[PDB]
């Protein structure tokens, strides 16, 4: 079925609806990491910004200075 026709400048179609993503999924991170708290199967994993490493294998604290959030 044809929905609609637009210019060949169209690059992507994306559905903008509440049920497109399960909004009620719980964030597993426990406010441990100093910078990034990425996800992994059944949990999370801390990481440092590019170039900075963990201090003395703390695996939560990096050599990078923390930066204020942008609103």
């Amino acid at each position: 079925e044809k929905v609609l026709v637009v210019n060949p400048w169209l690059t992507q179609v994306r559905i903008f609806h509440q049920l497109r993503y399960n909004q009620s999924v719980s964030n597993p991170c426990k406010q441990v990491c100093s910078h990034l708290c990425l996800l992994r199967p059944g949990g999370y994993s801390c990481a440092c910004p590019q170039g900075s490493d963990f201090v003395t294998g703390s695996t939560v604290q990096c050599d990078a200075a923390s930066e204020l959030p942008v609103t």
Partner: protein, 45 residues
């Protein structure tokens, strides 16, 4: 060493013992949750 009330990850990281059996694999290892007793439902079910 880790405190009485703090569980130990075998990597040398001490974490609060509450996180054991909380349902998420908290260590860099999976041994925060490996060895947890499964939830008991009912006898004969």
């Amino acid at each position: 060493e880790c405190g009485s009330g703090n569980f130990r990850c075998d990597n040398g990281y001490c974490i609060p013992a509450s996180w054991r059996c909380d349902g998420t694999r908290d260590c860099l290892d999976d041994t925060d949750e490996i060895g947890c007793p499964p939830r008991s439902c009912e006898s004969g079910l």
